[PDB]
Amino acid sequence: INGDWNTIALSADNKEKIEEGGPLRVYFRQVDCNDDCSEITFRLYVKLSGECKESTVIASQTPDDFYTVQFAGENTFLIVDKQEDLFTLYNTNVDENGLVTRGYAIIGKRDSLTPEETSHFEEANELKGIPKGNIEYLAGTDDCPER
């Protein structure tokens, strides 16, 4: 499931991590899977201190279909959904200070969700404790490059 992808929306119980400036407000660029997807390489940008910080990271599949990646702390995410033009993740981020920020991340080829996909995502968030308000839609706020 390789290619050039875009972050459509992000969510977090601690919204600050995905707000403009937070380390988890991640605008994706590439999601390259290996042969059996036991490792996924992610090229992505994060606006931090007014800088578009590029990162290229590997997420390895544990023996339980979960994925561990080091990025702004220890992260453990599952692929909650996977369609032809979209896919969602539910990550548990443990930053340097031990704060556990759990949340969702929709990544796809388009820049926005349909009305049906939107309500479904809102339900999934409130269901997993995250409020409807703690959902940032990164559409139109991607002022980073591909260098």
Numbering used by the authors: 4 to 150
Article sentences:
Mammalian lipocalin and secretoglobin allergens are associated with a function in chemical communication that involves abundant secretion into the environment, high stability and the ability to transport small volatile compounds. They all feature highly conserved β-barrel structures that enable them to transport small volatile hydrophobic compounds. Furthermore, we solved the crystal structure of the major guinea pig allergen Cav p 1, a lipocalin closely related to the well-known semiochemical hamster aphrodisin, allowing us to compare the binding cavities of mammalian respiratory allergens belonging to three different lipocalin subgroups.
We could solve the crystallographic structure of Cav p 1.0101 at 3.7 Å. The crystal belongs to the P212121 space group with five molecules in the asymmetric unit. Cav p 1.0101 adopts a classic lipocalin fold: an eight stranded β-barrel (residues 9-112) with a short helix insertion between β1 and β2, followed by a 14 residue long α-helix and a short β-strand forming antiparallel interactions with β1. An electron density that is observed in the central cavity of monomer E, likely indicates the presence of a 1-decanol molecule. In the four other monomers, the corresponding density is significantly weaker. This density is adjacent to the carbonyl oxygen of Ser14, one of the very few polar atoms on the surface of the cavity available for hydrogen bonding, which is likely involved in an H-bond with the hydroxyl group of 1-decanol. The Cav p 1.0101 cavity does not display any access to the solvent. The β-barrel side open to the solvent in the LCN1 structure is occupied by the sidechain of Phe74, which belongs to the short β5β6 loop in Cav p 1.0101.
